[PDB]
Amino acid sequence: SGFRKMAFPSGKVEGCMVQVTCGTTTLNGLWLDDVVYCPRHVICTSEDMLNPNYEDLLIRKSNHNFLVQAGNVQLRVIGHSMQNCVLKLKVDTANPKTPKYKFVRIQPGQTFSVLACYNGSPSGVYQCAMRPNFTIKGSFLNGSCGSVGFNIDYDCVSFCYMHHMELPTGVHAGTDLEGNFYGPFVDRQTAQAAGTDTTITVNVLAWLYAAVINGDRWFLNRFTTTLNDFNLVAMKYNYEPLTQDHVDILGPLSAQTGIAVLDMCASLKELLQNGMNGRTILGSALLEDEFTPFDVVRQCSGVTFQ
């Protein structure tokens, strides 16, 4: 038993991390097969940060201007190109540590592990959720750009995030591995509106199920509700609307606990309308929304999904 924010083991990703330097600036790159991926603002200086012309800056560069180091071994760069906001440096050697992998663009509300890195060397690993407003709340210092987010299914690493910037609000923004930013953000040193955020309803319900499985049951009540009534409450409390697809995804947790999904929705409704009265759920004094139903099952391997 127990329930803890749990990241994926990072070994497979560690072996892909390298250090990329262009003139002054160093950040991290991801070496897969014979291509290194890194944020394109590596080719930038503070003179250029408010409105970089990335096409012109890249024209001034040549293969040998990109210093790429995998641990202690220097890599030979044989080509470069820009795809959206990432650079792809072709190297003469395929990474012998390349895992089985895919590139994926995740949906808001999905979770992933981040391997925070500096100078191509790993520093730590933690779980993030892609907020509804397409930011993440991580731990990213100077030089952490190019650190990636990922999920592991058996033996395939699905890379879904590369870190590019911290907004003036202190939250974080980045791209998929094709270089496309999550959300409306751009790679320039400017104040940028992140949309209104909201709480990931389906994740709160999954975490309430995890709590019941772990023996925390005080919030269970004698009430039920409708999807429509619940969604009225959710909208009032800045929660994401709950769809039948969400109900469907919560099915296996409903089955293990025997608590109908709409009964749990009535429990959540009461928590939102009355607060938690100073009590806790799974060690937390607020309602947690960064565990997916998948995340919960992984840590409660008693429920039946297949």
Q: Which residues bind its own copies (CB under 8 A)?
A: 1-12, 14-15, 71, 115-119, 121-126, 128, 137-144, 166, 170-172, 214-215, 280, 283-286, 298-306
Q: 251: part of which helix (H) or strand (E)?
A: helix 251-257
Q: Is 187 in the site for ligand S1W (CB under 6 A)?
A: yes
Q: Is 41 in the site for ligand S1W (CB under 6 A)?
A: yes
The active-site residue out of 16, 22, 38, 41 is 41
Q: Is 288 in the site for ligand S1W (CB under 6 A)?
A: no
> What single letter denotes the amino acid at residue 47?
E
CB of 222 to ligand S1W, least distance (A): 31
Nearer to its own copies by Cβ, of 111 and 231: the residue is 111
Backbone angles phi, psi at 218, to 5 degrees: -60, -30
CB of 54 to its own copies, least distance (A): 25
Which of 1, 46, 62, 72: binder of ligand S1W (CB under 6 A)? Answer: 46
**How far is it, in rounded angstroms, from Cα 289 to Cα 293?**
10
Q: Total binding residues for ligand S1W by CB under 6 A? A: 11
- Residue 161: strand, helix, or coil: strand
Q: Catalytic annotation on 172?
A: no
Q: Are 197 and 178 within 8 A, CB to CB?
A: no
Residue 113, phi-psi category: left (phi > 0), alpha (psi -120 to 50), beta (remainder): beta
- C-alpha angle 113/33/36, rounded to 5°? 70
For the CA atoms of 26, 29, 33, 35, what is the dihedral angle to 10 degrees?
Answer: -60
Q: Is 38 in the site for ligand S1W (CB under 6 A)?
A: no
Q: Is 111 in the site for Cl ion (CB under 5 A)?
A: yes
Looking at the DSSP bridge assignments, the partners of residue 236 are none
Give the distance from CA 63 to its chain's centroid. 31
Which of 5, 11, 49, 139: binder of ligand S1W (CB under 6 A)? Answer: 49
The active-site residue out of 145, 160, 265, 300 is 145
Q: What is the distance in angstroms between the CA of the first residue and the CA of the last residue of the chain?
A: 21
Q: Is 299 in the site for ligand S1W (CB under 6 A)?
A: no
Site for ligand S1W in 121-180 (CB under 6 A): 164-165
- Hey, which bits of 71-177 come out as E strands? 73-74, 77-83, 86-91, 100-103, 111-118, 121-129, 148-153, 156-166, 172-175
CB of 86 to ligand S1W, least distance (A): 12
Count of CA atoms in the C-beta half-sphere (13 A) of 222: 0
Q: Catalytic annotation on 145?
A: yes
Which of Cl ion, its own copies, ligand S1W, none interacts with 50 (beta carbon under 5 to 8 A by kind)? none
Looking at the DSSP bridge assignments, the partners of residue 29 are 18
Residues in the site for ligand S1W, rule: CB under 6 A?
41, 44, 46, 48-49, 52, 164-165, 187-189
Catalytic positions, written as ranges: 41, 145
Residues in the site for Cl ion, rule: CB under 5 A?
111, 151
